Amino acid sequence: EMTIKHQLGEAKVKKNPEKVVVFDFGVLDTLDKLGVKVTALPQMNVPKYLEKYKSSDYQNVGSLMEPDFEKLSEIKPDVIFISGRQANLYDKLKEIGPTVYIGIDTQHYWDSFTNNMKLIGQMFGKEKEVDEELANIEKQIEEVKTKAADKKALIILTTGGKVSAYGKGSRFGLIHDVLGVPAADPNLKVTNPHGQSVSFEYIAEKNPDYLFVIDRDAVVEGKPTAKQTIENALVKKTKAYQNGHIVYLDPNYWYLSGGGLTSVSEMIKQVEEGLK
């Protein structure tokens, strides 16, 4: 048995749990990377890169925000992994089975990710494999930091033709904090998961060298809006647009997932491609 201290409390889990339930897609992609058998997940909306798990091979335990608590009672999980989207449901889930919070601390992204991945390693007897995969991600980080130098960036999320911004220490702060991309707005302190609502005027005025764009609507709705939103008078005149430095980050990772061995690796590859 393992005793796990996390941001929301403490859990007790058998090592090598057989019936694994996952509500965080970063953890799901970690288990997939390590070849750990998964029992169930919310299949209402699954990231494209994880569509293996949209299959009938797996039990459907609802949506990210609305678990199927009955179907969970029918499984009786050895462990339930949750992150931010389910934090408000910590107490209800804890009633059904061992429940581990495994979101990232955005103020300490690398250390929190490392801790989270090492817990997974310990739990499934995959300790050294995780240690090596973390090192391989670090090799990506050290290279990208050099390409990132001197390139002022802004991070935006688009939905419905409108935008929010994120900077240092935010949900998407790893672009600045981990990958060493300078912030076009250093005084932008954001903790809203949905970003700070901003205008196109704000983006134009900040006039970033690079604009990282995360299209919510591509994943939540099935209709891309990011290129339409960006194709706008105030953005089209930015350095970022004129220099071909609008970087459409894949929202299947950035919006729906993050914090896993595969997603963090792929997220860094997407940044690096954008900086190249």
Residue numbers in the entry: 25 to 300
Article passage:
They are homologues of the well characterized protein CjCeuE from Campylobacter jejuni. The proteins have a two-domain structure, with the domains linked by a long α-helix at the base of the fold. The siderophore binding sites sit between the two domains.
The crystal structure of apo Gst was solved by molecular replacement using the structure of CjCeuE as a search model. There is a single molecule in the asymmetric unit with a continuous chain from Met26 through to the C-terminal Lys300. The predicted and experimental apo Gst structures had an r.m.s.d. between all 273 Cα atoms of 0.62 Å. Thus, the AF2 model has accurately predicted the fold in the experimental apo structure around the ligand-binding site. In Gst and Pth, the position of the main chain of the histidine loop is closely similar in the apo, complex and predicted structures, with the histidine side chain having moved a couple of ångströms away from its iron-binding position in the apo and AF2 structures. In contrast, the histidine loop is already in the closed, iron-chelating position in the apo structures of the thermophilic proteins. Apo Pth and Gst have a higher thermal unfolding transition midpoint (T m) and are substantially more thermostable than CjCeuE.
